[PDB]
Amino acid sequence: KREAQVARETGETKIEVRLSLDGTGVSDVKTGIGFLDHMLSALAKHGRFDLYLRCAGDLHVDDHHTSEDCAIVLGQAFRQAIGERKGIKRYGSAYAPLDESLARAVVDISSRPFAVIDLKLKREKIGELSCEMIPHVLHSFATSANLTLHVEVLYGANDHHKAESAFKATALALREAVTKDGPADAVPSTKGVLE
Amino acid sequence: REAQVARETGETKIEVRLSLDGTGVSDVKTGIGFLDHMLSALAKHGRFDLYLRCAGDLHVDDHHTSEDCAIVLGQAFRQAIGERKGIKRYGSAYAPLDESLARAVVDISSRPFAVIDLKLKREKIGELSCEMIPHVLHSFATSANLTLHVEVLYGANDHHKAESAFKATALALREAVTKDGPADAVPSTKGVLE
Amino acid sequence: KREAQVARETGETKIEVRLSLDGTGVSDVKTGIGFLDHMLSALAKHGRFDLYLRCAGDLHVDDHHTSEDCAIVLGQAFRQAIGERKGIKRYGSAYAPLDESLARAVVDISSRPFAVIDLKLKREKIGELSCEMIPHVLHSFATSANLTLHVEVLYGANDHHKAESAFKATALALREAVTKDGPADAVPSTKGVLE
Amino acid sequence: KREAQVARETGETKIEVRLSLDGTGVSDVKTGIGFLDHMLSALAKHGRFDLYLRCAGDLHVDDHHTSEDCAIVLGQAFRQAIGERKGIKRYGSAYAPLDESLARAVVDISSRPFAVIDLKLKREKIGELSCEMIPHVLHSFATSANLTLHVEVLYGANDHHKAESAFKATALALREAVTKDGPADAVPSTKGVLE
Amino acid sequence: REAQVARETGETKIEVRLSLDGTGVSDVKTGIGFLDHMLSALAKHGRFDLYLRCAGDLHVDDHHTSEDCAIVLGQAFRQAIGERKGIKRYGSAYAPLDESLARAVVDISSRPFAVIDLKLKREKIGELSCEMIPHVLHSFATSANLTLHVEVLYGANDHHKAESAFKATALALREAVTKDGPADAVPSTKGVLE
Amino acid sequence: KREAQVARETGETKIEVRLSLDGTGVSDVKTGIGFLDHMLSALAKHGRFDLYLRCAGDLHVDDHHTSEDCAIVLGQAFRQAIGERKGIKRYGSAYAPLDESLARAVVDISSRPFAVIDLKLKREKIGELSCEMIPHVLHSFATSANLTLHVEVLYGANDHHKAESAFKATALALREAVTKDGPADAVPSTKGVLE
Ligand SMILES: O=P(O)(O)C[C@H](O)Cn1cncn1
Ligand SMILES: O=P(O)(O)C[C@H](O)Cn1cncn1
Ligand SMILES: O=P(O)(O)C[C@H](O)Cn1cncn1
Ligand SMILES: O=P(O)(O)C[C@H](O)Cn1cncn1
Ligand SMILES: O=P(O)(O)C[C@H](O)Cn1cncn1
Ligand SMILES: O=P(O)(O)C[C@H](O)Cn1cncn1
Ligand SMILES: [Mg+2]
Ligand SMILES: [Mn+2]
Ligand SMILES: [Mn+2]
Ligand SMILES: [Mn+2]
Ligand SMILES: [Mn+2]
Ligand SMILES: [Mn+2]
Ligand SMILES: [Mn+2]
Ligand SMILES: [Mn+2]
Ligand SMILES: [Mn+2]
Ligand SMILES: [Mn+2]
Ligand SMILES: [Mn+2]
Ligand SMILES: [Mn+2]
Ligand SMILES: [Mn+2]
């Protein structure tokens, strides 16, 4: 019932996403970048979202337009799947480790696009995904989802652990934030409106 | 789980009605608009129902009003919980507002204590002095007879910092007073929460 | 009910534990060290675990082999009680204070033994339990339980408050992580296996 | 005969290892990552182990799951091959240089999984093996082998020399630790048990 | 290669029997359990057989007991070696215990000397004062008439540090006293090891 | 028998060396510099080498050409005495103290000439051997022996003790490295060649 399909095409990328918020965690993601597929796969699995994604992008240039545009379209789908912002918890937070790494994510379904991202990534790339694109993906996702997202890797020593723990924490926090809670028609805001 | 408290001194005359198992509605008139907004947010995100009126000595400053509102609110919270059994006891939450992020942690401990760190930079937000904001939280915690930790981890806008703090506090309080497990269990290894 | 009984003996210690994860918080714990007893009693109480433990140890040497071996056996019991790692939340986190002290624990039922522990204890002992054994207990528990455990005392000033807040937080995080959630046969991992 | 065959399958990797502790140094290792194959070949050669390894892994993501899971299975095979922990030296240590680099490894067949690893690598990758995975390999090996491993690169200027000197030292130290020494049934522990 | 030594003062009364070519068995009763554990580890990992009893002045503190036990143990070790010929002379080893790592280096030199650095942080381990731990190793080396270097390179648990140090010492002593090469050869360019 | 003789003459020095690797520690060394004789005598004794050496050198200039050329000739002799690099341990390491001084030596019979030497000598001369010539002797030995040598004085306070502990440690490491071990035809390298 809470789902969305979004298609988007530019000169750089051509993307389709299908998203169900009330899923079982199944993913079929092919961005053209394996490590990004793994991160979005983790996001779906731990968020209990169902996610289908295809991207034909300009990887001959670099991984940037693909990664950013996948995040944009994912964010748009999440926004649409949420629907009217009523009857939900609105706020979610979670910690997820991976071995020595620990990450925290905090989500506010605010209708104010904003993100604060600090992943402490040390390397240049994880597989074929540039580390600089990893915060960019979370920022672009948050702004297109029209929500407020804070993600911090508190510490760690392995960048795959850092990134993955961040996606896992993000997934758990998003899941909590969009959970139905209390009266179905209550807007969870003192101003009575979440656009 | 509702309580009504009335309290009058030479500085302030206050009435509060608080229900723990509400829908978030509030009617809060402290005399200070920003404080009203903070307690409205507390009620909204705690799913508490809160009525509050204060006739206070604002011609002096905002201090006695804000503190006493916190004192009476805390007394009402303590009373509304009633016997400290069958509840989660511990709650914690994060709430942002844009660039600011706050955490609140609550222990329904019967030991009044607060650790508050809001990183507010300004002198006032509207007519509420920034120094009164941690004082409100501390006074609330002590009169509620509980342990409260509130940290603004970072931010750049004092309205965002303060409001994120009240939202996080609301969420943690809601969790801590949630009924969970056997109704008669005291959630303490010492068997007593006074 | 998810329960386990474990008996272990070496030349240093002879220990028996019985643990139920789906308990009411009852404990009957006698390790030979009162403060360790109190910490394990707080663990069971706030975890809603039921815990029986006896240790006949070598306290004439010091508190080390007793404390460590109690953690090993408790960890083994926890691992065995969880049984097949399916149908559970897998991730838990919690904060617990005690007056001026605040602790955070994060749990990942990962089948990867790992612990990151930072308790900020200033004393040599609390009662008859050496402070250096308190992180060792958490690390040994985590590794024998085959899970990932992160425990941090953020701040405080009383070592009994710090240690107890740590065990309380740990309890609450373990309780969340082992809570049944979603389809009973789902393995909460993108790799489909948690051994 | 001190030998083992171990197989392991997840959604990320499918691996088989065959190992003899009392070998001549022969290796047939194909992880999918040439530099890792070279390190493991070195380990077998200088440890006088015989090692066969095959991994079908998710290298399209990155080198992490392959490398980690190869180390996990290798460690498990080591644990099994040692068998009952009696009649062996238990402790091993060795230094190995490669030109300007010098490494030390220390092994304790302890039945307590722990590793302390400090390789001082400066690069992002050596061949297709990410440098961050090299400590992760040694740590995962040690924990799966249920032993205590300390490896330090003391100094050096070339990461291939640093990593290779570390595997060489590890090989020599492991060879020493599992060498039969003294009465066949003596347990090398004051507590009389090494599980 | 066995020796028996008995020593009595107004502080302590000690008997030791030590065999170098043992299986690692021990019966050590110093009156201090953690010291017993360390000397048991020493015997076990050195493949020495060690008997020790001490009736000491533990009402004062652990010092005279611990020191005199090390003194007598060292004297026994010196005597058990006998004429310093046909041995390796030099020994070294590392031993960890979990996060801690120690190194010991032995030279059967007939020059009493020790360099000890265990990085212990606590005041006591059980009833053995941490400051007595290096003193034990030093007093052992001087009475054994040898050169001993023991370093805890790093660690975080003092029982692990001390225990790793005794294990490494044991392994190094075992190597140093191992028979190797012609039985009459003195392992010194000066042709004498007194 | 693993023995060699080398005779070498330049306008600066005239040297004859005879070396046996499988000796009893006997030496007869006359370099012209007593302290250097004492160091090479210690090396022979603790390596269980037999060594004869005579140098007629330009001591009226300084100790340099003598000390370096003795090291060169000795290294050449060591290389010839080893012969085919097969059937040996290849790697050796050792610590030797002398009173307050402690030194570590590590040897790799690598066929790659390289030395890393750090003796921490404070004086100008020990007897008639200039302190700067002591690391020069070790480096020139290693490079002429065609092997990798690392020697460190970890600490100390007496330069005779530091130097002598260094030569003792070197001797012990060299003895271990050239010890016969395993099949006599095996080449102890993954590349199958030690030239
Ligand atoms: O978070 P909201 O939109 O529910 C209500 C806030 O009062 C709005 N706000 C935005 N900046 C400061 N306050
Ligand atoms: O948190 P409680 O009151 O349930 C039990 C604690 O053991 C009491 N305590 C308070 N300071 C130290 N311990
Ligand atoms: O957390 P898991 O085992 O469910 C899946 C991870 O992808 C495995 N992993 C372990 N290190 C890096 N990734
Ligand atoms: O190393 P072991 O297990 O042979 C004997 C040790 O006494 C056990 N131990 C583990 N931590 C402190 N001691
Ligand atoms: O180690 P030794 O006694 O075999 C021979 C040394 O040369 C003696 N010495 C002691 N200080 C300096 N040299
Ligand atoms: O140490 P070797 O020559 O047995 C084999 C090495 O792989 C060769 N090498 C030299 N530099 C890097 N590797
Ligand atoms: Mg010749
Ligand atoms: Mn961009
Ligand atoms: Mn992964
Ligand atoms: Mn006041
Ligand atoms: Mn506002
Ligand atoms: Mn221990
Ligand atoms: Mn307590
Ligand atoms: Mn990993
Ligand atoms: Mn190489
Ligand atoms: Mn003394
Ligand atoms: Mn011990
Ligand atoms: Mn020169
Ligand atoms: Mn000398």
A 10 A CB-CB count for A28 gives 13
- Cβ–ligand 2 contact at C168 (below 6 Å): no
Cβ(A191) – ligand 1 distance below 6 Å: yes
Q: Residue A167: count other Cβ atoms within 10 Å of its Cβ.
A: 29
Residues whose CB falls within 8 Å of the CB of residue F86, separated by 6 or more in sequence, listed in order: F184, F185, F186, F187, F188, F194
* Cβ E189 under 6 angstroms from ligand 5: yes
Axis crossing angle, helix A34-47 with helix A64-82, rounded to the nearest 10? 20
CA neighbor of F176 nearest in space, from F114, F74, F95: F95
Instruction: Give the angle F134-F136-F138 at the CA atoms, nearest 5°.
Output: 75
Asked if the Cβ–Cβ distance from D150 to E101 is below 8 Å, we say yes
Task: Give chains near B: 3+ CB pairs under 8 A.
Answer: A, C
Q: Are residues C85 and C145 in the same domain?
A: no
Nearest to C148 among A24, A46, A99 (CB): A99
Tokens standing for E85? 């010929």
Contacts of D190 in chain C (CB under 8 A): 11
Q: How far apart are CA F16 and CA C158, in angstroms?
A: 75
Kindly give the number of the ligand 4 atom that is closest to the alpha carbon of E160: 12
Nearest-ligand number for the alpha carbon of F68: 18
Find out whether the beta carbon of F160 lies less than 6 Å from any atom of ligand 5.
yes
Distance CA C193, CA D1 (A): 31
Looking at the complex, does the CB of residue D115 fall below 8 Å from at least one CB of chain F?
Answer: no
C42 vs B: CB within 8 A: yes
Nearest Cα to Cα of residue D147 among D46, D23, D25, D21: D21
Q: Which H or E run contains E79? A: helix E63-81
Polymer length of chain D: 195
F105 & F127 share domain: yes
Residue D154 shares a structural domain with residue D192: yes
DSSP per-residue codes, chain A: --EEEEEEE-SS-EEEEEEESSS-S-EEEE-S-HHHHHHHHHHHHHHT-EEEEEEE--TTT-SHHHHHHHHHHHHHHHHHHH-SS-SB--EEEEEEEETTEEEEEEEE--SS-EEEEE----SSEETTEETTHHHHHHHHHHHHTTSEEEEEEEE-S-HHHHHHHHHHHHHHHHHHHTSB-S-TT--SSTTS---
Task: Report how far residue F76's alpha carbon sits from residue D98's, in angstroms, rounded to the nearest whole number.
Answer: 21
Put simply, the answer to whether E33 touches C124 (Cβ < 8 Å) is: no
Domain span including residue D106: 90-195
Neighbours of B122 (CB within 10 A): 12
Residue spans of alpha helices (H) in chain F: 34-47, 64-82, 133-145, 159-177
Q: Give the SS3 label for residue D83.
A: coil
CA–CA distance, C13 with C36 (Å, rounded to integer): 15
CB-CB under 8 Å, D124 with A34: no
**Using a CB-CB distance cutoff of 8 angstroms, which residues of chain C are in contact with residue D191?**
10-12, 65
DSSP per-residue letters across C75-115? HHHHHHHH-S--SB--EEEEEEEETTEEEEEEEE--SS-EE
Q: Are residues B97 and B192 in the same domain?
A: yes
For a ligand 2 pocket test, name from B186, B189, B193, B194 the mutation site with the most ligand atoms within 8 angstroms of its C-beta.
Answer: B189
For residue B59, give both structure tokens: 């011609």
- Overall size of chain A counted in residues: 195
CB-CB: which of C61, C132, C136 is closest to E126?
C61
User: What is the CA C169 to chain-centroid distance, rounded?
Assistant: 10
Probe site for chain C from D6, D8, D12 (most C CB atoms < 10 A) = D12
The b/e string for F159-192 (b: 16+ C-beta within 10 A; e otherwise) is bbbbbbbbbbbbbbbbbbbbeeeeeeebbbbbee
Instruction: Quote the number of domains for chain E.
Output: 2
B103 close to C (CB below 8 A): yes
Distance CA C138, CA F98 (A): 43
Distance from CA of C159 to the nearest CA of D (A): 27
* Distance from the D15 Cα atom to the nearest Cα atom in chain C, whole angstroms: 14
Residue C172 CA to residue C93 CA, distance in Å, equals 7
Show which of A55, A89, A123 is a domain's final residue: A89
A155 exposed, middle or buried (CB, 10 Å; 0-12, 13-18, 19+)? middle
| Closest C-alpha to ligand 3, atom 9 | D65
For chain E, what's the residue count?
194
Amino acid in the structure at residue A189: S
The CB of F190 under 6 Å from ligand 6? The reply is yes
Give the position of tokens 């005969």: D1
For residue F3, CA distances in Å to B130, C112, F42, F85 come to: 88, 55, 19, 14
Distance CA B74, CA B68 (A): 10
D19 close to D57: Cβ distance less than 8 angstroms: no
CA–centroid distance for F169 within its chain:
10
**Closest Cα to atom 2 of ligand 6:** F189
Q: Give the gap in angstroms from C-alpha E106 to the nearest C-alpha of chain F.
A: 8
Q: Do chains D and F touch (3 or more CB pairs under 8 A)?
A: yes
- Residue F72 burial by CB count (10 A; 0-12/13-18/19+): exposed, middle or buried? buried
CA angle centred on D119, ends D114 and D122, rounded to 5°: 140
**Residue D143, helix vs strand vs coil:** helix
D105 touching chain E per CB within 8 A: no
Query: Which candidate in D148, D193, D194 is best for mutational testing of the C interface (most C CBs within 10 A)?
Result: D193
Please name the residue whose Cα sits nearest to atom 2 of ligand 5.
E188
**Locus of tokens 């907004």:** B37
From the list C93, C106, C112, which residue is nearest A99 (CB)? C112
> Between E158-176 and E33-46, two packed helices, what is the crossing angle to 10 degrees?
40
Where residue B115 sits, what CATH number does that domain have? 3.30.230.40
- Residues E178, E87 contacting (CB under 8 angstroms): yes
What does the alpha-carbon distance between residue C136 and residue D150 come to, in Å, rounded to a whole number? 18
Q: Are residues A99 and A83 in the same domain?
A: no
H or E, element range at E138: helix E132-144
Quote the CA–CA distance of A84 and A98 in Å, as a whole number. 35
Amino acid, res. B98 = D
Contact yes or no for C62 and E156 at CB 8 A:
no
Q: How does B36-74 read in b/e, with b if 16+ C-beta sit within 10 Å? A: bbbbbbbbbbbbbbbbbbbebbbeeebbbbbbbbbbbbb
Contacts of C96 (CB under 8 A, 6+ apart): B90, B105, B107, C46, C102, C103, C105, C165, C168, C169, C172
Contact predicate F64/F130, CB 8 Å: yes
Give F-chain residues touching E187 at CB under 8 angstroms: 45-46
Instruction: Give the residue from C71, C87, C86 showing the smallest Cα distance to C151.
Output: C71
Query: Of D66, D36, D28, nearest to D128 (Cα)?
Result: D36
Counting Cβ atoms within 10 Å, is residue B117 exposed (0-12), middle (13-18) or buried (19+)?
Answer: middle
Phi-psi region of E119 (alpha: psi -120 to 50; beta: other; left: phi over 0): left
* Strand, coil or helix: D110: coil
Exposure of F37 by Cβ count < 10 A (0-12 exposed, 13-18 middle, 19+ buried)? buried
Contact B98, A148 (CB under 8 A): yes
Residue C20 and residue C104 share a domain: no
Is B110 found in the same domain as B70?
Answer: no
Residue nearest to ligand 2 atom 2, measured at CA: B188
DSSP per-residue codes, chain B? -EEEEEEE-SSEEEEEEEESSS-S-EEEE-S-HHHHHHHHHHHHHHT-EEEEEEEE-TTT-SHHHHHHHHHHHHHHHHHHH-S--SB--EEEEEEEETTEEEEEEEE--SS-EEEEE----SSEETTEETTHHHHHHHHHHHHHTSEEEEEEEE-S-HHHHHHHHHHHHHHHHHHHTSB-S-TT--SSTTS---
Residue F146, phi then psi, degrees to nearest 5: 60, 45
Q: Is any atom of ligand 6 closer than 6 Å to the C-beta of F189?
A: yes
| Separation between Cα atoms, residue F140 and residue F136, nearest integer Å | 6
Q: Around E40, how many Cα atoms within 13 Å sit in the side-chain half-sphere?
A: 20
Q: Do D132 and A35 touch (CB under 8 A)?
A: no
Q: Please choose from F191, F193, F194 the residue to mutate so as to test ligand 6's pocket, defined by most ligand atoms within 8 A of CB.
A: F191
- For a pocket test of ligand 1, which of A90, A91, A189 has the largest count of ligand atoms closer than 8 A to its C-beta? A189
Can you tell me the distance from the alpha carbon of A60 to that of E111, in angstroms, rounded to the nearest whole number?
A: 72
Q: Which C positions 51-90 lie with beta carbon below 8 A of chain B?
A: none
Domain boundary among F89, F112, F138: F89
Give backbone dihedrals phi and psi of A91, rounded to 5 degrees, phi first: -100, 135
Closest-CA residue to E38 (of E178, E135, E123): E135
- Domain shared by B12 and B23, yes or no: yes
Based on the fold, state whether residues C105 and C71 are members of the same structural domain.
no
Residues E157 and E100 reside in one and the same domain = yes
Identify whether the C-beta of residue E194 lies closer than 8 Å to the C-beta of residue E110: yes
Q: Do C45 and B107 touch (CB under 8 A)?
A: no
The closest-lying atom of ligand 3 relative to the alpha carbon of residue C194 is 3
CB contact under 8 A, F38 and E188: no
Which residue has tokens 């000491």?
E56
Which amino acid belongs to residue D155? Y
Nearest to D115 by CA among A122, E117, C113, A123: C113
Backbone angles phi, psi at D103, to 5 degrees: -125, 150
Say how far apart CA A37 and CA E132 lie, in whole Å. Answer: 59
Q: Which residues pair with D116 in a beta bridge?
A: D150
Contact by Cβ (8 Å): E51, E22:
no
C50 touches C24 (CB < 8 A): yes
Chains touching chain A at 3 or more Cβ pairs under 8 angstroms? B, C, D
Half-sphere exposure of C114 (CA within 13 A, CB side): 21
Look at residues B33, B66, B88 and tell me which one is the last residue of a structural domain.
B88
Is there a contact between C50 and C26 (Cβ–Cβ < 8 Å)?
yes
Residues F171 and F47: beta-carbon distance below 8 Å: yes
Per DSSP, helices labelled H in chain D are 34-47, 64-82, 133-144, 159-177
Does D136 contact A at CB distance below 8 Å?
A: yes
**Going by beta carbons, is chain B in contact with chain F, meaning 3 or more pairs sit under 8 Å apart?**
no
- Residue D56, classified by CB atoms within 10 Å of its CB into exposed (0-12), middle (13-18) or buried (19+), is middle
Buried b (16+ CB within 10 A) or exposed e, C103-127: bbbbbbbbebbbbbbebebeeebbe
What is the distance between the alpha carbons of residues E138 and E123, in angstroms, rounded to a whole number?
19
Residues C130 and C62: beta-carbon distance below 8 Å: yes
Dihedral sign computed on CA atoms, order F61, F67, F70, F76: negative
**F191 contact partners, CB below 8 Å, separation of at least 6:** none
β-partners of residue D44 are none
Return the residue in F88, F117, F172, F190 with the most chain D beta carbons within 10 A, the one to mutate for interface testing.
Answer: F190
Q: Report the structure determination method.
A: X-ray
> Which residues lie closer than 8 Å to B131 by C-beta, 6 or more apart?
none
Which chains sit next to F, with 3 or more Cβ pairs under 8 A? Answer: D, E
Same domain, B50 and B95: no
Q: Are B1 and B82 contained in the same domain?
A: yes
